[PDB]
Ligand binder design. Structure first.
Ligand SMILES: CCCCCCCCCCCCCCCCCC(=O)OC[C@H](COP(=O)([O-])OCC(O)COP(=O)([O-])OC[C@@H](COC(=O)CCCCCCCCCCCCCCCCC)OC(=O)CCCCCCCCCCCCCCCCC)OC(=O)CCCCCCCCCCCCCCCCC
Ligand SMILES: CCCCCCCCCCCCCCCCCC(=O)OC[C@H](COP(=O)([O-])OCC[N+](C)(C)C)OC(=O)CCCCCCCCCCCCCCCCC
Ligand SMILES: CCCCCCCCCCCCCCCCCC(=O)OC[C@H](COP(=O)([O-])OCC[N+](C)(C)C)OC(=O)CCCCCCCCCCCCCCCCC
Ligand SMILES: CCCCCCCCCCCCCCCCCC(=O)OC[C@H](COP(=O)(O)OCCN)OC(=O)CCCCCCCCCCCCCCCCC
Ligand SMILES: CCCCCCCCCCCCCCCCCC(=O)OC[C@H](COP(=O)(O)OCCN)OC(=O)CCCCCCCCCCCCCCCCC
Ligand SMILES: CCCCCCCCCCCCO[C@@H]1O[C@H](CO)[C@@H](O[C@H]2O[C@H](CO)[C@@H](O)[C@H](O)[C@H]2O)[C@H](O)[C@H]1O
Ligand SMILES: CCCCCCCCCCCCO[C@@H]1O[C@H](CO)[C@@H](O[C@H]2O[C@H](CO)[C@@H](O)[C@H](O)[C@H]2O)[C@H](O)[C@H]1O
Ligand SMILES: CCCCCCCCCCCCO[C@@H]1O[C@H](CO)[C@@H](O[C@H]2O[C@H](CO)[C@@H](O)[C@H](O)[C@H]2O)[C@H](O)[C@H]1O
Ligand SMILES: CCCCCCCCCCCCO[C@@H]1O[C@H](CO)[C@@H](O[C@H]2O[C@H](CO)[C@@H](O)[C@H](O)[C@H]2O)[C@H](O)[C@H]1O
Lengths: 100, 72, 64, 255, 48, 77, 494, 106, 38, 170, 73, 19, 81
């Protein structure tokens, strides 16, 4: 794919976007978990931004029959719109969800 | 029969000239000068915004899908 | 029943006409004469109709 | 721009009650505003004919209660349009002069002896920068509808096929408007314009007493003032909305 | 520093941007009980 | 023959006019393109498109004359 | 030393030089006024240097200094994107605030310059401190200089005006102190890094909320508690009015991003309908009574109450857009309210000695430069597009509608009512007929001083309106940290 | 307090000091001076508020009655709804979008 | 009154009343039902 | 060209308004009228460009508002509906400009008047050429500010000041 | 402070502006002032607050399409 | 007619130079 | 008849009847800067207008002569056989 930029190594998270198994009194590990979650939520919203830019070019390209040519892009944008918001880490940091 | 242009800018009558009150020096050289120098510097400020970082990752995820074409 | 003033609206409307004698009659006579006669006012109410009517008949006679 | 031209000529007076004659004094303005008034009433084959008359037959073309309702309402609204178009063109150009002699005193007749050089001011037409716009807009008002009827009306025209004007196949009424609407309703606005125009001309020129009878009746006194005062909407807005807000501000400030 | 998810959902409740995993399935059950209508959003793609 | 939904899609016909007579609309809108929509240059192609649309309107007019009498002249709109 | 401590020492160094120059010359007051102005420009140059180096996507506080020595009370300075623009606003206003009031003081000029140079340090500190007791320390250290600024250089009703600001701000801020002391008792420190990790029990949060909001409601201020501002701003000197509206009214706005959004989230969520009910009411009442105000400078002060309510509902939206719009509307209010105060308190009062709108009419005929700027600042007060005020209101109003729709619907009525008073004031002073007959002699138009501070303030309002990304790119990542909530498929990742 | 009278009811031809506002230099002012001057909401003196509500009702009654006669006698649709091949369901957005007429009831 | 405004006035009038009856002669029978556009 | 239709009426407004002293009544009238005449000619061409050929034109300059899910650009789309509106807007604006040289000849303030005319044309172009609802709102408000400025052109008359309050607030 | 230009200060408007400034010194508690005060300070905020509580979290519009309901609760 | 001439001004050059 | 006005009032728009005697020179200079400014925005348009459909080779489309996207297309299409 597109090469990973030099600016995209300095700010790339080194930790998974989670708080499970993170000692809070280790401030270094804690702030990086905060950063990891915020960066993921933001990649998700810019993923929808880019799909929306493609939708627009399919709209101005297909004109009248965009209703039968731009449906795949419409799916992806509507999926992302329901799932990506920047909600922060504060709720995530302060609650644990067992997933069981 | 249009009239001559008229008026006193800064209230300075046609005889005399504008008298510098004191503020003018620092405000034109320091206050405004700092903003032009800040403006020219701001052009070379590296872009550390979250979006320039999030767009490039987002493109690499959608490139892994038919949504965005990859140059490779 | 009648008001103290001699004003009656039925009689008011009866006099809504051009009076037979008027002290101001000659002062106002310019508005109904000359350029302001009936014919003159509506002489050119349809400006291009006369020129167009004869012109359109010339085009209308295309059978010959 | 034509009304602005007669306001300029008559010393910035904007009242019909002080305008009269003027047809010989402003020939270009009268004809040009006759151009405009015929397309405003959608006289056949004018620019406004193809736009306003298709809205009427499209309302009846949607064979619904709401469509037939708006057709009746809009047709009545067209009747009053023809009435105030005659009013403007009759009282400003065709009626007896109702304003001072100064607008109508020429130099062909000598009213003066030692001041013949100046002081006549008889309602003349303006200059090139005034008339030029009026002539151009007249040509548009005659021909622009015909020359562009296909780009907009068409029958299956593809001018707006880039989804700039999306019509959903459920709402299409074009084909019925072309074929379903009867010729009577298609032609109905035309007869109304031609019939009312002559009726209002006689009631304004030949039989001028009757309208005086109407406004001097208590019934017509209220009907004339009701529509002159714009349905009293201004009255109820200042008294119950605008002044109410200014009282509320005072009560909060004072009490 | 951290608390059970159940503890917080008791004071604030789900909704108002607090969409805990499983919010949509529960909302369907909640909406069906109260409105008597099954939620079934449309596709948005003519294909599949 | 009637135009296929792919042919109507590929010739950018307006959706409300993707009906049986859209095969005459294909050249008409093509003639309008070449002639800049001048109302006196594509007369014959408008006529054919206009005439054809009249025929299906007439068939749809008769298609209610049986329906209206089936309900005894009741309201149907 | 750090670069954030240089911000504080320079205004202190200027105080020293004004105090000692007479000991080297009987010195002119013009020399005292150049020292104070050059000192404020240097603070603005440092602050632009800080902004060049600042990292727009960093979750660690920047330009900090390793203390390594702990006492009971210790100054800890740091900068985050949430605070950088508040610092910049303080450093752009203070130079103009001095220039605006350059001729109007006349007596006690050293004292006047020393108070402003001292205010600049105290207001700069309140944004730079990384503890909540230190925040309170500077959020309330500004009350003694402001009591004496109004009393020494204020208008006729100055004594009562200065008693109102001090006593209301003292009373309201002592309920904040009780809440801060409780959090310190439960956690052991008020340093932000340690306090933000900690999660309080709901009941503690609901009582910490009652006490931080009481403080902020008095200092916003809300409608039934705004009497101090109607007195303080009007009777204050022009320069004090510029500081109090642009910078002091923003201390409560920036204090919600520290004292409420990150540490009392459940309380903020379950009580937002109380906040929005108050915020809605203060949008309507303030606006109705701004229409009937007959003092021009008090018409500018009342306008501030309506705007603060839009940004208060924006900070309580739990939305990224309403939170950034709240900061944008506070920055926008800082420029526009400064200009309208300069017009009312510094141009009309200078030429007439009156603030009554009865005496002003047709001022555009003899003062065409004043009316041009006055129109632009009235349009921004009305939230017209192309000004930063429109962007902040739109984002503040959208997050209000997304949080609780009904209140944002009432709050949206600010579009009709801010417009109503702004144009009505304008048409009555600039327009409204010919030049008044109460003016015996002709008034001169804008001076090169009056023109260039009005032009500078308008320039910031319009340029930032066109490209708000100058401020928006810095807040995005840091605003992302104060949102409370999860999404069902984006959270708790494995 | 003087009478609370709008100054639009003063004589425009009196020897007013301020002719535009119709005021004199010493005359007493009502406490509501702001909204009593020439630059204030207008006062319409054509008829009474009660009589106005009547005449607004008569307009409405006349227009509703015209609507009532149209609902009694208005035409039925003359042509059957136009029928599309497949309802154009693909071209109008798929199954998840509304489509045109397709062999249904009427 | 100038001749130019006079020629323009009647010329603009003669613009209509030529288009009007030309359009009636050509599109009249179709408009009033005697014909069909084909 | 397309972005030049947008820019020309704006420049003539700025010269007439902030530089009327230097150009005078004649120079303001000439620059204001000529800029909108040129824009009118470029717009008649754009009607052939876009509408008769079915080629929509897209141009984005920079972002206006940038947030989460909110990206509103200073961008302009030219489609069949845009060029359709531009023709009456720019033909009538051009002619009213030429008309106003004769009508407002005796008025003292011609530079301010002609500046407001060009300002209105610029705002009306912004209203019909925008990519999004929020940039269309800039033209909507802009046309409102320009109508207030032109209803109240004679500020001395109180009736005019009441009527401009009505236009602005309604 | 600085000398201002000459203004024909109207004694009537000056005493009016003085009246507006000292007006609070004469507010009393009547049956009328209480009725207006209770309406504005209690009733309207309590009505706005009550609707704020009842409709809080009631609706969400994001991504809601046909077949879905706007009502969250 | 008069001969009073108006110079282009400093505002002219600051704007042009700024652009 | 012209209104009497005060001659000390300075306005950027001229004031009451302001026409300088250098009006033509200043108007000429403002015309060039307008022409120069509008020349830069034109070259921006040419390189940044976006089209999803290119014009026909023989069909009147004067944009063909300055916009880079079309010029790139028409030059590429001028390479065949
Ligand atoms: C967008 C904003 C919209 C709202 C603002 C509207 C402004 C209307 C301006 C109308 C023109 C005007 O007021 O002219 C007076 C004055 C210029 O005087 P002038 O009429 O050209 O004649 C020269 C005078 O003899 C002598 O004039 P002077 O004495 O003012 O000249 C002093 C000279 C140098 O003074 C020094 O001491 C240095 O200039 C400066 O003071 C330097 C500029 C200081 C600000 C820094 C740059 C900011 C950008 O205006 C200015 O100084 C402003 C300059 C910048 C204008 C920007 C806007 C241009 C139009 C868009
Ligand atoms: C760009 C056009 C700017 C025009 C400025 C005209 C001017 O200088 O007026 C001075 C004029 C005076 O110019 P003047 O030449 O008539 O002066 C003659 C003498 N007197 C002073 C009596 C009029 O003063 C005003 O009337 C100012 C009123 C405010 C004008 C505001 C114009 C800009 C509005 C921007 C709208 C933004 C909307 C965004 C959405
Ligand atoms: C919706 C919420 C309410 C919106 C309207 C709020 C009205 C607040 C008015 C605030 C004061 C405005 C200035 C008053 C002074 C003045 O001269 O008024 C001039 C004008 C009224 O002028 P006027 O009509 O009284 O003047 C008539 C006299 N001549 C003809 C000579 C001019 O004030 C307004 O226009 C106020 C706004 C009225 C809005 C009416 C429609 C409301 C629709 C609601 C749905
Ligand atoms: C929904 C259904 C309900 C609503 C629709 C009906 C509403 C009621 C309509 C009432 C119409 C009453 C017409 C009264 C005519 C009148 O009084 O004068 C109108 C007009 C006024 O002009 P005027 O000020 O008198 O100047 C002198 C020129 N006559 O005088 C003129 O201009 C003369 C031209 C008109 C004369 C004929 C009017 C025919 C009306 C039919
Ligand atoms: C009535 C309006 C009059 C406007 C007069 C001023 C016109 C200014 C024109 C500026 C043109 C900038 C051209 C930039 C091309 C795009 C390259 C780029 O990325 O620049 C970054 C920034 C944002 O632009 P971008 O992210 O690309 O937004 C998408 C739409 N293209 O783009 C930028 O560099 C913009 C930063 C400053 C914007 C101007 C702020 C002051 C005005
Ligand atoms: C916590 C307490 C509250 C702190 C609030 C901040 C207060 C700041 C006050 C500034 C310091 C006092 O300011 C001081 O004013 C006196 C006024 O008598 C000045 O003293 C001098 O003033 C003028 C100067 O021409 C002389 O006419 C006068 O005779 C002389 O006393 C000092 O030179 C100045 O330094
Ligand atoms: C939430 C409820 C309120 C929270 C707390 C706010 C309390 C504010 C109370 C301040 C009361 C006013 O405080 C008092 O005002 C009067 C003015 O009337 C001042 O009195 C002063 O002003 C008068 C004005 O005529 C002058 O004669 C003279 O300068 C002096 O006597 C007192 O010096 C001051 O102590
Ligand atoms: C206006 C004045 C309003 C009253 C003053 C504020 C009262 C606050 O006092 C409040 O009282 C309750 C009563 O237990 C306590 O609140 C909390 O106390 C402890 C936590 O330590 C918990 O076990 C208890 O369940 C909880 O209610 C706290 O002491 C305090 O949150
Ligand atoms: C933009 C700012 C404002 C946005 C927020 C306001 C949105 C308002 C949404 C109102 C509709 C909400 O969702 C609506 O609720 C009503 C009940 O009230 C219900 O309405 C339902 O009523 C009947 C039962 O009486 C059902 O059989 C029927 O299927 C449906 O119409 C549905 O659940 C839904 O149609």
């Amino acid at each position: 794919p597109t090469p990973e930029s030099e600016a995209f190594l300095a700010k790339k998270p080194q930790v998974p976007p989670t708080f499970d198994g993170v000692d809070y009194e280790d401030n270094k590990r804690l702030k990086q978990a905060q950063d990891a979650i915020i960066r993921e939520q933001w990649v998700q919203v810019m993923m929808g931004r880019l799909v929306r830019e493609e939708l627009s070019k399919c709209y101005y390209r297909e004109g009248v029959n965009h209703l039968e040519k731009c449906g795949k892009l419409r799916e992806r944008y509507l999926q992302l719109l329901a799932n990506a918001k920047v909600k922060g880490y504060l709720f995530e940091q302060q609650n644990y969800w067992s997933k069981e | 029969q249009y009239d001559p242009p008229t008026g006193w800018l800064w209230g300075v009558r046609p005889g005399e000239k504008y008298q510098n009150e004191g503020w003018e020096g620092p405000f034109f050289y320091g206050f405004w000068g700092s903003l032009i120098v800040f403006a020219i510097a701001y052009a070379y400020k590296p872009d550390t915004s979250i979006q320039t970082w999030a767009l490039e990752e987002a493109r690499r995820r959608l490139e892994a899908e038919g949504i965005l074409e990859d140059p490779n | 029943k009648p008001n103290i003033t001699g004003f009656d609206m039925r009689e008011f409307l009866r006099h809504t006409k051009t009076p037979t004698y008027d002290p101001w009659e000659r002062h106002e006579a310019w508005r109904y004469t000359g350029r302001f006669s009936r014919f003159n006012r509506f002489k050119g109410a349809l400006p291009g109709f006369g020129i167009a009517t004869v012109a359109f008949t010339a085009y209308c006679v295309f059978e010959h | 721009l034509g009304a602005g031209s007669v306001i300029h000529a008559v010393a910035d007076n904007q009242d019909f009650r002080k305008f009269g004659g003027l047809i010989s004094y402003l020939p270009l303005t009268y004809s040009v505003m006759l151009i405009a008034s015929l397309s405003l009433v959608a006289f056949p084959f004018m620019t406004g004919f193809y736009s306003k008359d298709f809205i009427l037959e499209s309302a009846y073309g949607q064979f619904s209660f709401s469509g037939v309702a708006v057709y009746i309402i809009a047709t009545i609204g067209a009747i009053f349009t023809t009435l105030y178009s005659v009013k403007v063109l009759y009282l400003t150009f065709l009626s007896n002069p109702n304003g001072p002699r100064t607008y109508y005193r020429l130099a062909i007749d000598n009213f003066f002896s030692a001041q013949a050089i100046k002081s006549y001011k008889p309602a003349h037409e303006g200059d090139f920068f005034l008339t030029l716009p009026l002539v151009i807009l007249a040509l548009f008002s005659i021909f622009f509808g015909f020359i562009t009827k296909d780009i907009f009306i068409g029958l299956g025209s593809n001018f707006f096929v880039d989804n700039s004007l999306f019509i959903h196949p459920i709402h299409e009424i074009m084909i019925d408007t072309e074929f379903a609407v009867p010729v009577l309703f298609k032609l109905l606005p035309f007869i109304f314009t031609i019939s009312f125009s002559v009726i209002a001309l006689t009631l304004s020129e030949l039989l001028s007493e009757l309208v005086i009878y109407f406004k001097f009746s208590r019934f017509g006194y209220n009907i004339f003032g009701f529509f002159n005062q714009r349905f009293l909407i201004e009255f109820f807005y200042n008294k119950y909305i605008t002044n109410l807000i200014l009282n509320l501000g005072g009560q909060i400030t004072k009490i | 520093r951290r608390r059970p998810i159940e503890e917080t959902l008791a004071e604030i409740g789900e909704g108002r941007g607090i969409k805990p995993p499983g919010y949509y399935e529960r909302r369907a059950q909640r909406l069906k009980e109260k409105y008597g209508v099954d939620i079934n959003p449309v596709c948005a793609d003519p294909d599949q | 023959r009637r135009a296929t939904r792919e042919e109507m899609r590929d010739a950018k016909v307006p959706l409300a006019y993707r009906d049986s007579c859209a095969h005459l609309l294909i050249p008409l809108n093509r003639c309008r393109y070449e002639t800049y929509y001048l109302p006196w240059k594509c007369e014959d192609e408008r006529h054919s498109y206009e005439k054809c649309q009249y025929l299906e309107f007439k068939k749809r007019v008769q298609k209610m004359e049986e329906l209206r009498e089936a309900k005894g002249g009741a309201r149907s709109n | 030393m750090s670069l954030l401590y240089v911000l504080l020492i320079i205004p202190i160094i200027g105080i020293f030089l004004i105090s000692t120059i007479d000991s080297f010359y009987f010195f002119n007051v013009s020399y005292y006024k150049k020292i104070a102005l050059i000192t404020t420009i240097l603070n603005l140059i440092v602050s632009l240097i800080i902004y060049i180096l600042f990292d727009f996507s960093n979750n660690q506080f920047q330009f900090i200094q390793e203390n390594l020595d702990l006492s009971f009370y210790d100054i800890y300075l740091g900068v985050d994107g949430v605070s950088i623009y508040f610092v910049l606003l303080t450093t752009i206003i203070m130079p103009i605030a001095l220039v605006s009031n350059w001729n109007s003081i006349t007596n006690n000029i050293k004292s006047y310059l020393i108070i402003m140079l001292l205010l600049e340090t105290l207001l700069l500190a309140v944004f730079l401190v990384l503890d909540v007791l230190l925040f309170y320390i500077f959020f309330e250290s500004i009350l003694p200089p402001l009591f004496i600024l109004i009393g020494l250089f204020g208008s006729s009703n100055k004594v009562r005006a200065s008693f109102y600001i001090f006593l209301y701000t003292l009373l309201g801020s002592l309920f904040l102190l009780l809440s801060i002391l409780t959090m310190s008792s439960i956690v052991g420190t008020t340093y932000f890094d340690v306090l933000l990790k900690s999660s309080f029990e709901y009941t503690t949060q609901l009582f910490l909320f009652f006490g931080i909001f009481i403080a902020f409601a008095v200092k916003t201020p809300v409608w039934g508690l705004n009497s101090w501002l109607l007195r303080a701003h009007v009777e204050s000197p022009l320069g004090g009015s510029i500081v109090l509206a642009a910078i002091v009214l923003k201390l409560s706005l920036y204090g919600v991003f520290r004292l409420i959004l990150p540490i009392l989230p459940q309380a903020s969520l379950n009580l937002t309908y109380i906040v929005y009910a108050i915020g809605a009411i203060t949008v309507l009442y303030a606006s109705f009574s701004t229409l009937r105000t007959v003092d021009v400078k008090e018409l500018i002060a009342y306008s501030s109450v309506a705007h603060a309510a839009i940004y208060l509902m924006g900070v309580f939206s739990n939305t990224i857009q309403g939170l950034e719009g709240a900061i944008l509307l506070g920055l926008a209010h800082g420029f526009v309210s400064s200009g309208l105060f300069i017009c009312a308190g510094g141009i009309l009062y200078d030429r007439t000695g009156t603030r009554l709108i009865y005496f002003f009419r047709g001022l555009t005929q003899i003062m065409p430069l004043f009316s041009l700027f006055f129109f632009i600042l009235c349009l921004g007060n009305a939230g017209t597009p192309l000004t930063l005020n429109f962007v902040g209101e739109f984002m503040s109003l959208y997050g209000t509608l997304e949080r609780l729709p009904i209140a944002g619907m009432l709050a949206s009525t600010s579009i009709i009512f801010s417009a109503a008073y702004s144009i009505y004031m304008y048409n009555r002073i600039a327009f409204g007929g010919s030049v008044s007959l109460y003016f015996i002699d002709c008034f001169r138009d804008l001076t090169k001083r009056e023109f260039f501070i009005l032009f500078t303030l308008v320039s910031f309002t319009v340029i930032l309106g066109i490209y708000p990304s100058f401020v928006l790119d810095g807040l995005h990542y840091n605003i992302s940290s104060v949102v409370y909530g999860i999404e069902p498929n984006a959270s708790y990742l494995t | 307090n003087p009478p609370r009278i709008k100054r639009q009811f003063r004589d425009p031809h009196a020897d007013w000091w301020d002719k535009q506002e119709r005021r004199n230099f010493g005359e007493p002012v009502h406490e509501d001076h702001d909204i009593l001057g020439m630059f204030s909401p207008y006062e319409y003196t054509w008829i009474t508020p009660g009589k106005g509500l009547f005449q607004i009702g008569l307009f409405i009654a006349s227009f509703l009655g015209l609507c009532y006669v149209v609902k009694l006698t208005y035409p039925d649709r003359v042509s059957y709804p136009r029928e599309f091949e497949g309802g154009l369901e693909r071209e109008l957005g798929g199954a998840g979008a509304v489509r045109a007429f397709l062999c249904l009831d009427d | 009154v100038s001749r130019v405004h006079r020629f323009l006035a009647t010329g603009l009038g003669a613009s209509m009343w030529f288009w009007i009856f030309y359009r009636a002669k050509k599109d009249g029978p179709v408009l009033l039902g005697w014909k069909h556009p084909w | 060209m397309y972005l030049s239709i947008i820019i020309l009426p704006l420049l003539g407004s700025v010269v007439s308004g902030f530089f009327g002293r230097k150009v005078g009544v004649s120079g303001a009238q000439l620059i204001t009228c000529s800029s909108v005449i040129i824009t009118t000619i470029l717009s008649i061409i754009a009607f052939f460009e876009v509408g008769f050929n079915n080629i929509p034109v897209t141009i984005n300059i920079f972002r206006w508002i940038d947030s989460e899910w909110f990206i509103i650009n200073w961008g302009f789309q030219y489609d069949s509906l845009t060029v359709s509106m531009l023709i009456p807007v720019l033909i009538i604006s051009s002619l009213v400009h030429i008309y106003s040289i004769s009508y407002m000849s005796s008025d003292p303030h011609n530079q301010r008047f002609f500046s407001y005319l060009s300002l209105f044309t610029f705002m009306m172009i912004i209203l019909v050429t925008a990519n999004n609802y929020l940039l269309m709102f800039v033209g909507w408000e802009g046309v409102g500010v320009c109508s207030y400025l032109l209803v109240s052109f004679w500020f001395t008359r109180i009736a005019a000041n009441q009527s401009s309050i009505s236009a602005f607030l309604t | 402070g600085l000398q201002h230009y000459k203004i024909a200060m109207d004694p009537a408007l000056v005493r009016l502006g003085s009246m507006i400034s000292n007006r609070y010194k004469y507010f009393r508690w009547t049956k009328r002032t209480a009725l207006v005060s209770f309406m504005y300070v209690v009733v309207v905020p309590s009505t706005i607050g009550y609707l704020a509580y009842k409709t809080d979290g009631l609706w969400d519009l994001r991504a809601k399409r046909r077949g879905d309901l706007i009502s969250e609760r | 007619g008069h001969n009073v001439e108006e110079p282009l001004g400093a505002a002219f050059y600051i704007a042009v130079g700024g652009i | 008849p012209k209104i009497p006005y005060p001659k000390h009032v300075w306005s950027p728009a001229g004031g009451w009847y302001a026409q300088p005697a250098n009006w033509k020179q200043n108007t000429a200079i403002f015309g060039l800067v307008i022409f120069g400014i509008t020349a830069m925005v034109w070259k921006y348009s040419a390189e940044h207008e976006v089209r999803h459909k290119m014009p026909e080779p023989d069909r009147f489309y004067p944009s063909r002569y300055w916009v880079k996207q079309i010029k790139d297309y028409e030059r590429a299409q001028k390479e065949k056989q």
